[PDB]
Write a protein that binds this ligand. Structure first.
Ligand SMILES: CN[C@@H]1[C@H](O[C@H]2[C@H](O[C@H]3[C@H](O)[C@@H](O)[C@H](NC(=N)N)[C@@H](O)[C@@H]3NC(=N)N)O[C@@H](C)[C@]2(O)C=O)O[C@@H](CO)[C@H](O)[C@H]1O
Ligand SMILES: Nc1ncnc2c1ncn2[C@@H]1O[C@H](COP(=O)(O)OP(=O)(O)OP(=O)(O)O)[C@@H](O)[C@H]1O
Ligand SMILES: [Ca+2]
Ligand SMILES: [Cl-]
Length: 264
């Protein structure tokens, strides 16, 4: 039985209590997922939460939830006891039965603090990553509210999981597509490659270790630098590394499988 890390139990309980109070009778479930449960919880890591609701939130509820989550969350790395929160809200009707691509009602995150602090909220929108979120939750998650994931959601067809995995791959193209997110994108490409090759999901760090000995050394050096920064061991100048990041992205677009090698 998967366990909530003691060091996030208090904050996680407070988030669960807030989400429960604001959503009320529409709440179907709350699931903890991501590196807190699957492994690889770093000092800058956020706490990943999926909220499943039955009906869309009112305009006032969205504002209440967004504003109060701001007070429960801190920028990543600002505090060892008050982590960044990521809260994704989805309609049950978008997942059972599946809609492809599924829509997400709402997303809270620290990368939106400046907008959210002004009352600017993302509307409901289509998100291919929701297929990957649910797939990961089906394997590794904890129900803070409601039923365990395997009793609530069904697996997506492999054909849709493939499309969800390759969607960001086709979108990363230019220097500006990757600028500001260099090591994140390099590591996520490693996780995508891993999943398409083995059918499984794994941590950012472990995916980098899996891919490294398979790469020509020039691409291994870029992956090693992204891994080393993510592990907090060295902050690179990613403006100098940008051309090598672009080459890494192109290499992954050329070499990552176009079909599962080993389904999920
Ligand atoms: C939804 N989670 C947050 C989000 O992550 C995103 C992150 O997405 C980033 C793209 O790579 C980048 O090319 C894109 N850059 C562009 N020039 N388009 C970013 O804008 C995008 N970030 C974003 N929408 N907040 O890369 C994806 C693989 C992701 O992990 C999930 O869809 O954005 C990250 C910051 O960019 C946050 O750290 C995450 O918590
Ligand atoms: N093959 C993949 N395996 C895992 N995550 C993937 C994959 N492809 C894309 N992603 C997406 O990348 C994002 C990773 O989430 P997130 O950045 O919170 O990472 P994490 O594993 O929880 O680590 P961290 O401790 O840095 O938060 C999710 O949106 C996830 O769906
Ligand atoms: Ca996370
Ligand atoms: Cl860990």
């Amino acid at each position: 039985t998967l366990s909530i890390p003691p060091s996030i139990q208090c904050q996680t309980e407070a988030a669960c209590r807030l989400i429960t109070r604001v959503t009320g009778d529409t709440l179907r479930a709350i699931h903890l997922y991501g590196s807190a449960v699957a492994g690889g919880l770093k000092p800058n890591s956020d706490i990943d939460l999926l909220v499943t609701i039955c009906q869309p939130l009112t305009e006032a509820q969205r504002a209440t939830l967004m504003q109060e989550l701001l007070a429960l969350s801190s920028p990543p790395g600002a505090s060892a006891e008050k982590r960044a929160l990521q809260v994704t809200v989805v309609l049950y009707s978008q997942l059972v039965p599946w809609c492809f691509p599924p829509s997400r009602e709402m997303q809270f995150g620290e990368w939106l603090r400046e907008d959210i602090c002004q009352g600017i909220y993302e509307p409901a929108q289509q998100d291919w990553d929701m297929v990957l979120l649910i797939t990961q939750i089906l394997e590794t998650s904890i129900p803070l509210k409601g039923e365990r994931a395997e009793r609530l959601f069904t697996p997506a067809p492999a054909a849709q999981l493939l499309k969800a995995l390759r969607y960001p791959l086709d979108l990363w193209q230019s220097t500006a597509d990757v600028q500001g997110d260099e090591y994140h994108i390099v590591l996520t490409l490693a996780r995508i490659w891993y999943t398409l090759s083995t059918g499984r999901f794994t941590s950012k760090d472990a995916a980098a270790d899996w891919l490294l000995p398979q790469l020509p050394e020039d691409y291994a050096a870029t992956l090693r630098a992204a891994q080393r920064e993510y592990l907090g061991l060295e902050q690179q100048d990613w403006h100098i590394l940008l051309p090598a990041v672009v080459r890494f992205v192109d290499f992954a677009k050329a070499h990552i499988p176009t079909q599962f090698t080993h389904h999920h």
